[model samples]
Target: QVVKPTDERIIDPSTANTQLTGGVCYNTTSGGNKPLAGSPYGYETWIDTGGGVCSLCWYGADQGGGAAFKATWCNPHDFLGRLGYFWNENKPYSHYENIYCGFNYTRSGRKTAGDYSYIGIYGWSRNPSASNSNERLIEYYIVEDWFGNQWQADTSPMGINTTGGTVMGSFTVDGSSYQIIKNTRVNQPSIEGDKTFVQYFSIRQSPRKSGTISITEHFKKWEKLGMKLGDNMYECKFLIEAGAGCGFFDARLIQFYRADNEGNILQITPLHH
Candidate 1:
């Protein structure tokens, strides 16, 4: 399919609302609600911005952090028509990072990526999520941490690919407008991506406000060795850092909590809403 810029990609142009592009899947036609599972890169996104609606609201926060550099790294080959992550200093999203470590640290000391000086990540929006060096197992180049050693990432709907041993459980208890998604993993992305290009993720669910999926360096961190989850929260964060990210995070999520008739995980391909 012919690709364009996220700034202009419309999920349902006819509908006129693009933020729903968060649910844009690479279905047969290249547009609409389709699940983005079993992809080549293990994930899929749009080729341009604004195509997925709030999926790439350049005008919103988290856009001005120089995240646009990633767009320049667009692989016109296998990834021609896909949406990717681009840090924008103008658009702040609570937690933002565009840092890099000089070298890969083989032995972590609960403080560094192989002992290399970590560059620093930026933060915007209202609430920010905490992550760590482990997320590098997946996410390409978001960030590692700030000068203070606090791990971070684009904490929205970022998920654990089914391929991994990650076990995620999503649900909306009682009747709340916001839904929560939880997962278990050995490694997580905390400020892992970078500029020079964009990172697009096409899924089949609308991000309800925003959510969190914190995976600790080890089970000890999650066990609330120190800080725990919030009060009346869905979890005690007994195993890792947990919280919510601002913006239309639903775009980053591909599955929704399903119990009976109200929830169904949709596929970016032939998406069934």
Candidate 2:
């Protein structure tokens, strides 16, 4: 199912933990609820109504058992009118399951512009019954400029990155610059695990109203810095994580597609919006 750029959908009420048009659902976790995409076995995307200090995620990837809430915000604008949510989950990774391909993306969004809101891919290991107490994640932050690191907050004190991992360096993606950073948190039990967040952030950049970026190249670049691509590669969700303050965000994932072994493009066609 390839969700084309022309397709649209809207799950009436757009409530919490509800699946909307195109394999999308919303999970507020510890904060407020909204809409999201994808399934329990594939990569997903999401959007937040913005506000509060919880895992206010827009995208998530839950495979087998480990649940990783990707893409979050730290505080957003209020009232994200209609252009609300979008996503395409349920399609297995196919032979590309644990492999890599260029992620071509484009969209338009904003909420009071530069309000210290973080958006992009934020993933973490969430295995409820795993004997190991170590959690892990690899995040690709498209925008985090508003002095973001200072606003990091989690429900539990053990969530935020305490010991700033290690400033690796910087790089560029889709004409945008991102500072490579590594951080760790000592909080959370087996459910949360010892958190390790590797982020690639755009310098002073906000969400792109419209653009395209291939993620495969970025992952390969990180491999040089001991960045492991995926272990079982459960979930891959695009998100708008609203943190701290109450806000609104009218955003959309215009298109999301991948390449196959035969180098053919397979897209997720949406049913409605």
Candidate 3:
């Protein structure tokens, strides 16, 4: 029970049966490095320009599930750009008893007075049982829409200094109201490499472009506020991060799925383009 943000379950960009056309463009002055594949509805196509300078594109339909994107960046120093989906494997989060994502996007550009960006749903949650291997990883986000100025409002934009962390509280499922932040990125770069993790955020104080993102009710409300996730499972797609930027994101519709414990759906993640 517990899957009711009106529960219609989005996914309706004309029923998208694969119409994405030619994309997978990258920038950072054309440096190089692009070989992460698996799309055609199965999802897992990524691109990163962590070196900064940016221009990104992923149109999906063959090599990338149809999420449709177009981005641009400037004034980047680190955390430059990101495309989406990079699930290395799944099955955790209570074995997907319920997790949903449904989207529809349309964004234009502007962010140049120092930019820090995020769109929606990024991922990571590790800890293969963790006996004590430096605490295993956990970097998450669920921001649903942003383009420049409005770092969750209340004046906090420019490259995002943080007074926003440690909120760790706020909820209200689909109709809106989500604040819950807790940060600590000590060693940095994770997934097992640079260590020191934990960065969960669910910041959606009413900035949307389409609905349905119950996503295990924000991972069961961040483990009831203790914020623990990682019995295994790494990757939950549809992201758009940028640190300093000029922008454009255009995901006409995205759909990740899983459901059981009574809600039905068992698996979804196919837009075939």
Candidate 4:
């Protein structure tokens, strides 16, 4: 894939393990008019590789209610053999077949009994062949800013720059002071795809008890939510880590946990509020 501006690439449908590289992403379809341009399965997904494996996604406005979930890999190399959950008798979420995403785990829930902490959660797990068919309830806010519109490829050596800045202050992101950031910070407006079919990036902020970690600009705000960030609308989620440094697309725990630091170690915490 030609990683450059104005260029396009059709990623192999089987290539689902790159999700862990952490990057920003956004899907800006003028409308739910067509399937994701060239994406396989017609699944709506976008990414920015600037970070590592960070992605902000928007589900298909047309998908019916069902258990929709997004999968990503912390380490694609080790996660490839994680597809063993279906055969494990001790697994609580053993409802998949041979998927290649690597140590694939589901974030379709919250720390609470049924809530998920991540932003783009299981909007729908209605894959036709899915064994554990589930109906998911989800809501989407329109794009106040066209930040997740388009991105550049990362082939040529250049600086990281994007046009969708601030999201024009029309939407709201859910996160703490240190983990989530936007606008004047290190975080960008929305999903920014770099490289043709890889290299996605975005910005965020994480709020802390002692102070705020400007997720974007890396600016530290030594303030509390109730006092500075306010309440309610600011409900945020933490990074949900499993087995310390575990998980992958397929479910092979050992392979996914090789380096004790490789593979997917963290996921967005399930939301409660």
Candidate 5:
């Protein structure tokens, strides 16, 4: 169930911040819904440059353990990029290690894995920190693409096997094609640590444009394909990752929200319409 936004907030995507959480989750401050605050522990927002473009957009690096980055870090300064949302459910959805709720969003940015750049959603079970660093736990993603290198061993409709996880297969949702990748732990061994965990990715294959996708649908699909949904859902985030070098990225968010299992709209971010 997709619920549209009633009110709309035109966010500026240039502003940013970095949060350092040892075992705590970061919440939205008063950065106007466009802060880059998450793992590596960074966040960034956007602002209209008047000429329909962004001047500057970046965030802080707060990734811990040895890994140092997680959360919704993005470059927000486009028409559709300002419209995005996160599913922050305080109610315990379920318990699978550190897995909790989920997130759904759409963002467009420029990056290459050669420099460590990516844009997508994130779910972290435990926070990574050096002071109280214990278990970085599990982290998952529904990535559109990781710029630069083709970080996978094999690719098939069933899955894309990478060093971290396997791209399960392809499917259609909301008239779009996607490939699901399942990893036990994310690639940031430096910060997320070497403790056993999992990272699941649902990536958009075709229609390389702006649109929305459902996390629930992907979860259901993965479960059908023998992917573990895990336990104890934690944090849900949408972001853009700046891996290396001096590059720029941007996007415009139009809508973001969450729904129940029975196709009932639960909550939603303010929509443009």
Candidate 6:
């Protein structure tokens, strides 16, 4: 029952609309294209620009229930992500006996003048639920917040060039401590395309803007440190990746739920007002 953030759904992206040619814009460099279309507010947008630029906006009509957004990027050499609502379903995380998320945000430009950046929960996890050329796929992240200059003197939050993976340790739930790594993305460009997956991280060593993200307790602590999770669950949402500079994220309250082993949350996004 801890999912707060409702000051009338706070949103003042400089009085709404930061105007980079208003809403949904995705300049490209033709990297890993994914945009068959899905964002009239229901969310499910991903923009990969191996060369940079991204934009998104959604406000009233309770876009995606409690969602209020504003995401802007300028140098995305590889990502601009989104999701929510089981994201076009394929459920399996033991059929959601638990999975939660709640957020409220605020961020500004030039995030540490990026060279590699990150924001929060990203997704992907699959096994036999459909993926050709030999199964298994897992690309996960739970990093709370980041933007680099040194990123805690280079602990390397999602910049992956080494010094941050292979840790596979650490615990403590939704209030702090999260440093489980394990990386390897040799052929990259997933959702089953270019393949070679296995990248899991929980990395949140003190960074926050709001609260709650019990997402099945980091997939049951990454399957008790073996870092295993793939029975088909995809889309864990809220993300912001960058490889260069310029930023903006003002998500004032986002919500997601599923807690039914009799606890009964089952509310995936309904909190409008």
| Number of the top-ranking candidate, with TM-score as the measure | 5
Model 4 alpha-carbon drift over 4 Å, by segment: 1-41, 44-67, 70-202, 207-273
Give all TM-scores, in the order shown.
0.19, 0.49, 0.31, 0.18, 0.51, 0.32
lDDT of 3 at 58: 67
Candidate 3 residue spans exceeding 4 A from truth: 1-21, 24-58, 61-63, 68-70, 75-97, 100-115, 119-165, 169-179, 182-214, 217-219, 222-237, 243-255, 262-267, 271-273
What TM value does model 3 have? 0.31
Query: For candidate 1, lDDT tens digit of each residue in 1-273?
Result: 212112211122222222322122332223311222332111222333412221222111122111111111111111112222222223322122111111111111232211111111111111123243222122211122211123422222233331123222232211222112223333332233341211111111232212221111111122232222211111110000111111111121111111112212211111235
Clashing pairs in 3: 18-272, 18-273, 61-273
Instruction: Please give, for residues 1-273, the per-residue lDDT of candidate 2 as tens digits.
Output: 322122122111112222212223343442222333443223332334444332222333232111222233344332111111122232322323222211212222333223334444433222223333332343344342222333342211211142245656667665566555555445422222445334433232232333444444455555576544344333344344433343333223323344444535444323235
Model 4 steric clash total: 73
Model 1 residue runs over 4 Å out of place are 1-81, 88-161, 171-273
In candidate 5, position 1 carries an lDDT of 43
Q: Could you give me the TM-score of model 4 versus the true structure?
A: 0.18
Q: Candidate 2: list runs displaced more than 4 Å.
A: 1-116, 125-163, 189-207, 260-263, 271-273
lDDT of 2: 0.34
Ranking by lDDT: 6, 3, 5, 2, 1, 4
Indicate the worst ten consecutive residues by lDDT in candidate 4.
251-260
Candidate 3 per-residue lDDT, tens place, 24-44, comes to: 666643332233344423233
- What local lDDT score does residue 224 receive in model 3, on the 0 to 100 scale? 95
Better of 2 and 4 by TM-score: 2
Q: What is the C-alpha lDDT of each candidate?
A: 0.20, 0.34, 0.60, 0.19, 0.40, 0.60
TM-score of 5: 0.51
Comparing candidate 2 with candidate 6, which one achieves the higher TM-score? 2
Task: Give residue 189's lDDT in candidate 3 (0 to 100).
Answer: 68
- Stretches of candidate 6 above 4 Å error? 1-61, 73-97, 100-113, 122-214, 217-219, 226-244, 247-255, 266-268
Worst 10 residues of 5 by lDDT: 96-105
